[PDB]
Design a protein around this ligand. Structure first.
Ligand SMILES: [Mg+2]
Ligand SMILES: [Mg+2]
Lengths: 659, 661
């Protein structure tokens, strides 16, 4: 008696899905269920050479833009230099020795490196050569450029803003929430802070200069109680003046997909705040976003922050939109998510959709909006939990400061500050909500003006002037183009050609029912496919790179690529060309279910889980994800994999037989 | 990727306990709770040299004994050679290519290696204990493969003894071995699910034709051989299978690596038989179900069965309560408990309680075929009476069980296949060995007890008892081991019931709060023998960390088994625990499901599974006594009370959000 044979089998299975050579051998000749795929266009040698040619040209384009000189930073206030923080936690300084330290002053260095071929090689292997080359040459995943970084930083720290007229009553109307879903912030702080969610590998900011996971004990055990003590004694000025690095941010260039042709003019900045400040404010921010209604749940709400497409969401959007009324008679339907908007109105009874773009919206976010949002979120909590009002009002003051006036490093030891409170410091906790409110306030006023009779605000020329003069918002010319909505699309038809949250809305068939699903043209799926958000990693083994392609193919199929013939066929070719042992190996990501899709708005929580790491997204299964309460199993690539790997298939052996 | 800080901390803690360098640093100034310990007696240098001298002398004794010539194997029937099994499972033969194959015939090679156990534990004993005693104790016993000479000598002894057929019926077995029929497994279920329920040792040999560990051979056994076996059972066609694939019924006769007395290495090495996995797993359905249903003597006063007795949670005291019911010899029934070849006998003479603990000499040679067949029939009948729709299948399995216990062909060394000349004599290692031994012993002691009631009170005396067990039951009682002892029926704190052992342990009373607690006990010298003779040989790639952690785990196991109740044994184990490095105490460990390897002693609990509460606690007197107490639960003390927060580098501080500012 050590263990049951059943337990023995279970343990053998765990080890077996870790033996790639063993999986290869045991899956040999197994029945494989193949996804639909496009036919091969060229051989491995040609596909790889064609991908290398594109990559070489892009590397050259990046190197040239990265060589451009950049403007001076004179548009910011200069604050001198900060001393490296000396606070100790036990045996070590919280600011690690010999890092981010130039002769005792805090220092940083911006990364603009000039360093994706695997996915591009696949696209050339299975898709049209000219189309793949032309698409892949337009966009690249890059650190960007000094010149474009400074240009964009200037644009969002020097804009003339308009202070919004906003009150708690108005925000209740535009952003209703469920008070019973707010976290009880009159509880103990440690336990509240331990509840916030964040990215384990994101930077903890100054003074930690480490990942959040590495810095977490220093933040929790050492800095947070120090911060708390000075908050409640109203003594933050002493802490700031003695330990300025505790309130210092870092201004960083965002590595991202960028258009090759504007690399020299556009790289997006964002700000990385100290871990203790962002974690503390996240208690309010994440509690509030968790409690917000979205527009499909409450027709007075302008909020789409929280909207998600699966489980009927896509159709919820359309049902909500069809309620839009005749302009100048009845309310339009306006949904705001960060700087993204979906606008519906009727003219002569016909439904129209507008999907305009703001230019560098964060530069237009005025300080009055920022303070009103903080006050609205704080007041929501203290109305429900009034015994903790004063503590969280102090936190709200920290939040406003972080969003508007934190000092920050860029490159070297020079500390900077924005000249004015106006302009949102992108990346601060709550960025998305600040953007959403500013947009909704502007569109709410727009809708009021329609009811006042100014129906020419339906027209681009006057709309652009209105948003600029009355709200300090820049609507990109050419983006205000009302489109006739196909209100009840037929099978395979689009709602409109416009995108919201990065996706089109389409109707497809399941049985004989219409299902609303996300969609994109092939070229847009291809752009995402060929520009993975990962740099050359020598660590990445052939097996890991092979598995990455499989996971990314699954992710795009679930996001809607299964509903485009070519995109579906490309992802299917990737899946079909994945080795059996790579399909069936044990994987870490997704809790062993396989890495979830990159697209953030499939579900409200943001966490999507594949049912199994060795399934693939068939049309039927993905459609079932977008249908309401209509479930389908994810199909296995190798139906017999479990028993093949275990080298055992149960046979019923009856003990009751006559002998 | 996106996680709560709470989950982030939990994940950090997991990583932290795998980083020995980090643990060492974070536990450096940690406040340590010390177990009671003996003081250091000599330095490391002197302790290692003294240990080296002992191992060197033992290695020499073993090599010489292993050189002794062995007697011939002519006392067995010889059956020729068997062909290597050719059955394929998918892409491979069930009998691995290029192993156990001599020109197409099945072959084995007995291992009699000259490597003893390790010297780490012996070094600790020299470090913290008296030099003469450690040396004298260590020279007496060694963990060894044994010798050819002793192996064959012992094999002959248990395959050639004249046995006495027992007079036994289902009615008598019901009387001596009551069981709960509702606890029997429903063997009219589907066979696969029944076989997947049996428990065995993942790394034991799967036997012929697999020649692999049970873990490695399991899919071959389950998916390939078992259904083949099943098909031939239900078609009454086993003869076809045996004649075509004889390796499917072949056993291996093996020398048991074990602790052995150095001075008898040449005369005594234990044989046992390793049967094919498919046979032992199939029969284990009945055997393990039956032992799960058996009553033990402390639950039913008619039962002679202690197979299933366990010491913790009041068991030790249950034994004493049960024993005190023994009556005046020749007037009222004694109290007799049988476990394998071990017995505990109680009777009263002039009202005074006496205890006998005799030893059988190689009892398996004495187990007669009538007893074996009766035990199988009783176990089968119990199941088919409770589950009558499966009578015929399990009656066929019972026939296989009897063959495996009495007549399986077997290899020893080379290709020669042998068989025991007679049915009599139990093939030690067959599934059910313990029960077969237990029934044979109980049948004999039941007859002994009957003779007392008939007036034969001279059977209380060794001379007449030994003659009776030989002549009436073919059992050999070892001279000098029938020595009735006055029992201390109500021992005071620190006092023994008797100095005798049962299941390897003495019975003692100790104090907990203000109550008496009955606990297992041993003299220091016996704990020391076990401590210095680990059941493990030298293994390369066994890092110092693993070796240090093994000493820690073995010290815990001995303390829990009863060493905490002997002052010197407690002090030696405590010295080892206290000298274990903090990072070794607090590191993450695999054994015991992350709680630390459980004690080697098998009878702490009935199911056999013992789990430590935490891998970084130590067994204090208070905690161990609580395990033997009837309910009284106690927490296992941590060696480093602050380890968790030190390792996490975080200790919660209450920060009130309701403050006025
Ligand atoms: Mg848009
Ligand atoms: Mg005994």
């Amino acid at each position: 008696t050590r263990l049951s044979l059943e337990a023995m089998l279970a343990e053998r299975a765990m080890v077996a899905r870790q033996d790639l050579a063993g999986l290869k051998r045991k899956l040999a000749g197994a029945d494989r269920v193949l996804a639909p795929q496009s036919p091969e266009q060229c051989g491995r040698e040609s596909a790889q050479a064609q991908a290398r040619s594109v990559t070489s040209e892009l590397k050259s384009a990046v190197k040239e833009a990265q060589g451009l000189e950049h403007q001076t930073l004179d548009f910011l206030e200069q604050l001198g230099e900060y001393p490296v923080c000396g606070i100790l936690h036990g045996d070590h300084p919280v600011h690690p020795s010999g890092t981010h330290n130039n002769n005792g002053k805090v220092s940083v260095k911006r990364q603009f490196a000039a360093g994706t071929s695997d996915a591009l090689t696949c696209a050339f292997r299975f898709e049209d050569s000219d189309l793949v080359r032309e698409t892949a040459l337009k966009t690249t995943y890059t650190d960007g450029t000094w010149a474009g970084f400074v240009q964009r930083l200037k644009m969002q720290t020097t804009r003339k803003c308009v202070q919004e007229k906003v009150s708690r009553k108005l925000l209740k109307q535009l952003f209703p929430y469920d008070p019973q879903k707010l976290v009880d912030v009159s509880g103990e702080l440690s336990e509240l802070v331990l509840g916030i969610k964040t990215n384990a590998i994101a930077s903890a900011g100054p003074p930690y200069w480490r990942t959040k996971r590495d810095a977490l004990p220093d933040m929790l055990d050492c800095v947070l109680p120090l911060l708390y003590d000075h908050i409640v004694r109203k003594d933050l000025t002493t802490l700031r003046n003695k330990h300025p690095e505790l309130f210092l941010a870092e201004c960083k260039n965002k590595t991202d997909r960028y258009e090759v042709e504007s690399l020299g003019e556009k790289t997006r900045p964002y700000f990385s705040h100290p871990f203790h400040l962002s974690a503390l404010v996240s208690v309010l921010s994440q509690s509030f976003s968790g409690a917000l209604k979205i527009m499909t749940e409450d027709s007075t709400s302008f909020n789409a922050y929280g909207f998600s497409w699966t489980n009927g969401g896509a159709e919820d959007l359309a049902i909500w939109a069809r309620q839009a009324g005749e302009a100048g008679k009845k309310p339009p339907r306006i949904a705001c998510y960060g700087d993204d908007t979906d606008i519906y109105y009727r003219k002569d009874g016909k439904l129209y959709r507008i999907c305009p773009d703001f230019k560098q919206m964060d530069g237009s976010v005025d300080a009055t909006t920022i303070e009103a949002v903080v006050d609205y979120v704080v007041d929501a909590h203290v109305k429900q939990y009034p015994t903790a009002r004063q503590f969280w009002e102090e936190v709200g003051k920290l939040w406003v400061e972080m969003a508007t006036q934190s000092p920050f490093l860029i490159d070297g030891t020079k500390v900077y500050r924005k000249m004015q409170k106006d302009g949102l410091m992108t990346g601060v906790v709550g960025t998305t909500l600040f953007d959403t409110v500013k947009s909704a306030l502007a569109y709410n006023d727009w809708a009021d003006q329609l009811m006042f009779g100014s129906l020419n605000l339906l027209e681009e020329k006057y709309a652009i002037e209105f948003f600029k003069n009355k709200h300090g918002l820049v609507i990109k010319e050419g983006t205000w183009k009302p489109a006739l909505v196909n209100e009840d699309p037929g099978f395979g038809e689009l709602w409109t050609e416009q995108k919201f949250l990065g996706l089109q809305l389409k109707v497809v068939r399941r049985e004989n029912e219409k299902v609303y699903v996300p969609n994109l043209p092939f070229e847009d799926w291809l752009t995402m496919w060929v520009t993975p958000r990962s740099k050359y990693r020598s660590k990445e083994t052939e097996t890991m790179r092979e598995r990455t392609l499989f996971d990314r193919a699954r992710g795009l199929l679930v996001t809607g690529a299964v509903f485009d013939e070519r995109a579906r066929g490309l992802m299917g070719a990737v899946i079909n060309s994945t080795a059996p042992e790579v399909v069936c190996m044990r994987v870490q990501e997704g809790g062993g279910r396989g890495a979830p899709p990159a697209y953030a708005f499939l579900t409200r929580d943001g966490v999507f889980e594949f049912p199994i790491s060795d399934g693939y997204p068939s049309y039927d299964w993905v459609v079932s994800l977008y249908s309401r309460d209509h479930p389908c199993d994810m199909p296995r690539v190798f139906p017999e994999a479990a028993t093949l790997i275990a080298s055992y298939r149960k046979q019923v052996m009856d003990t009751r037989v006559v002998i």
